[PDB]
Design a binder for this molecule. Structure first.
Ligand SMILES: N[C@@H](CNC(=O)C[C@@](O)(CC(=O)NCCNC(=O)CCC(=O)C(=O)O)C(=O)O)C(=O)O
Ligand SMILES: [Fe+3]
Length: 292
């Protein structure tokens, strides 16, 4: 018996759970990373039903529905002994989830270190979770060293992560990639940092007049809108926004310091442990930083 304090209250787990259902992408990733193949998982946001990078670790994992509204009947049918939920997706059905199986919840879906710690405790894989996080911390420390070596007096760089969607544009100031960049020592322009300090993670922008909020020494562009009915609309948004005088006046744009066509799965959708290491690898490549 283990008692866990989490985002939605306290949960008693009897035993070492062996049948876990993961209700957000990162939880699925973390379960696999901890050596526990979920019996059930929400479908992937793209490459449905299972992201290519992980699907061979999810063979026989049953799909329990879409992350915004998983199918409680399908979860029930799996006879899970642990459900991993989030307040952001599942707050309103948390009691219903708890009637099926002990359910633990993080606040959101993208804080993969919190997911890893919580799931480590819930699964009796605390030592495994610690080793995963040590590996990430090591990679972060090495990146900071290599970045300082390349950029010298210009380190730290300011970064922004700009996401073109079908009908608006976002800045992932925090969120999955924004928090990782923060770990890596990248900073934000003062106005963007003020948004973060005010508790904003993901900023939705509706006007090209807001483009200056994106200003940075380097800009990472992600084309992603999983639930758009028309994939072409993301490209239309990118075309319109990147064609504006505002975009052309950004520091990174002027200096040819924009990384375009980044993999949305690595940069946002997967949400998990494995992608964190991959994102850091991407940065060595896109920034031409010697792993020295
Ligand atoms: N967007 C759509 C489709 N999903 C995505 O594209 C991925 C993601 O949901 C991942 C994420 O990390 N969301 C942040 C969760 N925390 C919140 O505060 C709610 C924000 C939220 O999910 C939203 O406002 O869209 C994303 O939006 O990046 C949705 O959600 O069905
Ligand atoms: Fe979303």
């Amino acid at each position: 018996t283990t008692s866990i304090k989490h985002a939605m209250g306290t949960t008693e787990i009897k035993g070492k759970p062996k049948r876990v259902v993961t209700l957000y992408q990162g939880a699925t990733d973390v379960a696999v990373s901890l050596g526990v193949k979920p019996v059930g998982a929400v479908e992937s946001w793209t490459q449905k039903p299972k992201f290519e990078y992980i699907k061979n670790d999810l063979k026989d994992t049953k799909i329990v529905g879409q992350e915004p509204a998983p199918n409680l009947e399908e979860i029930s049918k799996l006879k899970p002994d642990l459900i991993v939920a989030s307040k952001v997706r599942n707050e309103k059905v948390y009691d219903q989830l708890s009637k099926i199986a002990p359910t633990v919840s993080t606040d959101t879906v993208f804080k993969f270190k919190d997911t890893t710690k919580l799931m480590g405790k819930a699964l009796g894989k605390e030592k495994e979770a610690e080793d995963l996080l040590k590996k990430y911390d090591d990679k972060v420390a090495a990146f900071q060293k290599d970045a300082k070596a390349k950029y010298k007096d210009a380190w730290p760089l300011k970064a922004s992560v700009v996401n073109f969607r079908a009908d608006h544009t976002r800045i992932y100031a925090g969120g999955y990639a924004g928090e990782i960049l923060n770990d890596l020592g990248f900073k934000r322009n003062k106005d963007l940092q003020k948004q973060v300090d005010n508790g904003k993670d993901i900023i939705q922008l509706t006007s090209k007049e807001s483009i200056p909020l994106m200003n940075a020494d380097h800009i990472f562009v992600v084309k992603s809108d999983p639930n758009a009915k028309d994939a072409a609309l993301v490209k239309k948004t990118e075309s319109e926004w990147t064609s504006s005088k505002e975009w052309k006046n950004l520091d990174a744009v002027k200096n040819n310091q924009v990384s375009d066509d980044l993999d949305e799965i690595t940069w946002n959708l997967a949400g998990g442990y494995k992608s964190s290491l991959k994102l850091i690898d991407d940065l060595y490549e896109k920034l031409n930083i010697e792993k020295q």
